[PDB]
Design a protein around this ligand. Structure first.
Ligand SMILES: CC(C)C[C@H](CN)n1ccc2c(-c3cccnc3)cccc2c1=O
Ligand SMILES: CC(C)C[C@H](CN)n1ccc2c(-c3cccnc3)cccc2c1=O
Ligand SMILES: CC(C)C[C@H](CN)n1ccc2c(-c3cccnc3)cccc2c1=O
Ligand SMILES: CC(C)C[C@H](CN)n1ccc2c(-c3cccnc3)cccc2c1=O
Lengths: 308, 311, 314, 300
């Protein structure tokens, strides 16, 4: 059994030892240390070379690795500075699939046009402020792209889905601060059935009266996200801010393995009800704005050289 | 200014007086009393007669549902459909007391599955909090669903049907043909159901599996985007009752869309604010910080169920 | 196995059937139904006829309260006394439906102050969640309190009184002499009130100020430690109803003290577990926890339990 | 206005820059950055040279900022016990306040360890073997005998703070928070001292050796004189509302806190300017100390 012991500041400030001491500190500090262990296990799996046999399985679809990592996050984390943390992972191909919620696409693209501010015509998101002007700049940028998307649908047989639209918006924003710029550049698909539930939806709706008939099919994206999970050698999940992806994915009939590694960081409670098996997930009960940068510092950022 | 005073049990037990006394009890009891007041205000607005030969904008809404003086949006998380709140929601939909439903992944199939086999109390099983759904329930559902999915794909070819989540949910409600089903009553009463996340759970696993046996099903979210927005834009007045989480974010006022803010908005959930989880403005919402499994039946008893005669 | 089924409003509004249907609704509704079952079992145990040597228990407990077949401890946070749940608690104490009260800093003075001036709904003021207590209410209480503290110090110094929080709370309840007061009824019915944190808030500010005018008041917690323990040790059976937080931690079973675990334990609060917040001794029964604001749940619980057995307490 | 921007890991892992970037990250990360600013302001005030003992009835010399450190007992069961012990060891705080269990869980750890989980006492994901309490009871009983004798023969008027100082002196172990508090004349307040296991043992002891008195009114005067004679007041309150923020009282000559940080996961909705970080203090408090007190070790 491991004894409870906190970091001793009589040693001075050794940041690596202080962060490792979370594991023996207890409560959510211990969950954080278990999350670091799970994510380091994911990364070490991902960096294992595929055999010529495994490599063959992999190509039945970006290059397959030994661990396909799904990174799911709520839109609020894109409004926060965690946008930079996510952009870094996507930029360096450290994760394979993104899943987000309503607002999670446009809040990244808008930040390329105008900043979000700290608080305590304004959109308030917790202690953040997005001036209404930011949405106006975004709408002016978006409308011509929606025109091209409808023309391509009608003249070049394009069958749009949320993931194909998000790839197109990332290509158009053409800005290395953008999560979605890097995802499309690095062939990391982005899934968001809720893509139209917020401001981007208001704009697509408005656009549809002057230029009707845009179709966004969710069933083709249903097949694409499943293909990422079914053809994976191994599956990891890092899910932030809420239940963006429920942990139970193991499905014998679909040939879909459970995740070998799963980390959840959120402040949701269980009490109101909010093939390889599904591994026991690690849950850190904490604001991901605090915890996710610390997790990335102790895991992905330690293996930067291997992803360059 | 209103004095804090709880119900006096020396009066014995008058449930109406006990429930009204929540308003002066404080903390979330007071919020419950304010939620009762807001929903009763919504209902009284809805029951106001609408102006003579009123422009329906049936051509603008593409809906067969007649306009009332207050369009009520009822949003709820799937977990509430697994709970007994399924019965509470089914009652409101059955009596045309709400106009639009919005739900999350699982919120459709957990209602339909309960028509085939029961969900059980806990403490091959799917655990949802203290509830248990036997895996066999999903097997029965899949056997029932596959032939309907076949008909839906063929109707794209034979009838020019352009499926959306709302149109699929109405079809599944018609097929289940069971008056215990929320979705049976919604399609019978022309109450549309919106759920872009329709395919994110077990129903999605089945649609995915079916799509290799019978390819072609398209579910378009943009036509549903237009349908849900036109319900809010052509509303004379808007009410929102949102349960279990942020199924719908409160700020809907949009001058460019001529979309009024809600005049009345009630939220019942246990989510925290601290981690960030011309047109009429968005009225200040009432939030009751509580499990909707406790609060929603009490809310309905003191509001909709009091005005059953008018519906 | 019990099927999940909510109340069907097609039956109309039958409040008793609606409240019973919480049991089959799931999530915290089911926990509420379990809490009603546990409290009804506590009350039915309490109402079972006893035989016992009255003088004998009295000399061991140093209490005038007669033993029943179940000793019920009611614990609550001070915020619930600021709320309308003050009326709910006062009712239970008035009718001798509970045996012992335990509260936290503020839980005594917020009841006494309401006898002098009202607390108001919000959304010089003390804000307690969405409640407002005007600062003037505390000034009226201070004016009322100072002469009583003078008498308490005189009785200590001339009549050998050894003050404890429970003895002080009984004296304040006697002095307020107002049937709206929880503490008026507790002292009238010989229900002791325990609060080691009695002086951590406004009442403490006033005791502190008074000690400059009239020094040497002693409030001993060790004699109260013995009084609360003897209530639990000489209990035939123990129930706990704990509101608003962990006012009393549920594990009380102690072989060395001959202190039985609770046979029935109900907790109503919104606290989380995640941040760490010989067949002769009865075990600690598994508690029922309802994750809910007690301001909503406690009156419903009382309606379906204690209020149904009012006849047996007359 | 400050722009929202997270730490860019393209810059590599620079821990000081990463921790500062919490300030511009938003949500509770921003609150953490504000908490570091408030505590650094407290420390800078405390280290200002000053231009009392008969008024406070304390041997502790006044500084330019009196810091009250309040914490729930669960944090003493956690590894935050080490973080608290460090601050007390180096006289970086002036007054401790805790809740039921917060004294004995420090002393018991000097006799036997607490273990990680997921005859055992469970405290969240921590395990305290029942034998730990048995070793503590064996150690405690002789001290209680001496305390009652000193009361009855040497006129000692015990209070929770005087008992906690005595237990810290007796444990005589530099891993103990309460050892360092009594060594450094840092008083510890706990009216709830007897609500838990230590109370069970004092109660048991009272049968064979009756009449121990623990007075709370003398402690009421001692904690107030710490606040009244303060030039400036800082509060660091962990795990819950151990001390409510509003202390300003004109009639008592008691100033409000100039600086206040609260770290806990309590919600305001059921009725349970300071900086509040809504977070488990087991995660946040070591980071806060690393960027504040530990940076100024030389000055202490
Ligand atoms: C993780 C997935 C491979 C499996 C899992 C099965 N429950 N699953 C599927 C889709 C899925 C989607 C989705 C659906 C359709 C189109 N675009 C995205 C979105 C969010 C979560 C999931 C999700 O959790
Ligand atoms: C409530 C709505 C009238 C406006 C509001 C604007 N933020 N809005 C829009 C769509 C919407 C949708 C949606 C989108 C597309 C297809 N089916 C459903 C789903 C959930 C929430 C919203 C939602 O909150
Ligand atoms: C409930 C009790 C019989 C036993 C239990 C043992 N853990 N216990 C004891 C005292 C106790 C007290 C107390 C202490 C001293 C004076 N006045 C009140 C206060 C709050 C909780 C408890 C409490 O939880
Ligand atoms: C911080 C204090 C100077 C003033 C403040 C006024 N509300 N105050 C007082 C006592 C106090 C005590 C206390 C009381 C008596 C004996 N031992 C400790 C415990 C906890 C918090 C407080 C507390 O918050």
């Amino acid at each position: 059994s491991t004894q409870v012991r906190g970091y001793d500041f009589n040693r001075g400030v050794n940041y690596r030892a202080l962060l490792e001491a979370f594991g023996t500190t207890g409560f959510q500090a211990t969950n954080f240390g278990r999350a670091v262990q799970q994510v380091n296990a994911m990364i070490e799996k991902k960096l294992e070379p595929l055999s010529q046999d495994e490599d063959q399985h992999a190509d039945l679809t970006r290059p397959l690795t030994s661990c396909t990592i799904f990174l799911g996050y709520t839109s609020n984390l894109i409004s926060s500075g965690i946008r930079e943390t996510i952009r870094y992972l996507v930029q360096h191909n450290m994760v394979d699939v993104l899943v987000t919620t309503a607002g999670g696409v446009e809040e990244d693209l808008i930040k390329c046009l105008a900043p979000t501010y700290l608080g305590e015509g304004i959109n308030r998101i917790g202690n953040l402020l997005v001036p209404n002007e930011n949405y106006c700049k975004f709408e002016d940028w978006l409308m011509p792209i929606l025109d091209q998307m409808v023309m391509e649908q009608n003249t070049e047989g394009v069958k749009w889905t949320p993931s194909k639209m998000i790839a197109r918006l990332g290509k158009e924003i053409n800005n290395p601060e953008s999560v979605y710029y890097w995802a499309q550049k690095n062939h990391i698909p982005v899934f968001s059935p809720a893509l139209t539930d917020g401001s981007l939806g208001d704009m697509i709706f408005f656009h549809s009266y002057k230029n009707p008939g845009l179709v966004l099919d969710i069933v083709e994206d249903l097949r694409l996200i499943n293909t990422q999970a079914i053809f994976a050698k191994c599956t990891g999940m890092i899910i932030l801010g809420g239940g963006v992806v429920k942990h139970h994915i193991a499905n014998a009939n679909l040939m879909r393995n459970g995740a070998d590694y799963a980390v959840y960081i959120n402040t949701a409670q269980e009490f109101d009800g909010s093939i390889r098996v599904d591994a026991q997930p690690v849950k850190v009960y904490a604001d991901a704005s605090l915890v996710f940068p610390l997790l990335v510092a102790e895991t992905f950022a330690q293996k930067m050289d291997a992803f360059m």
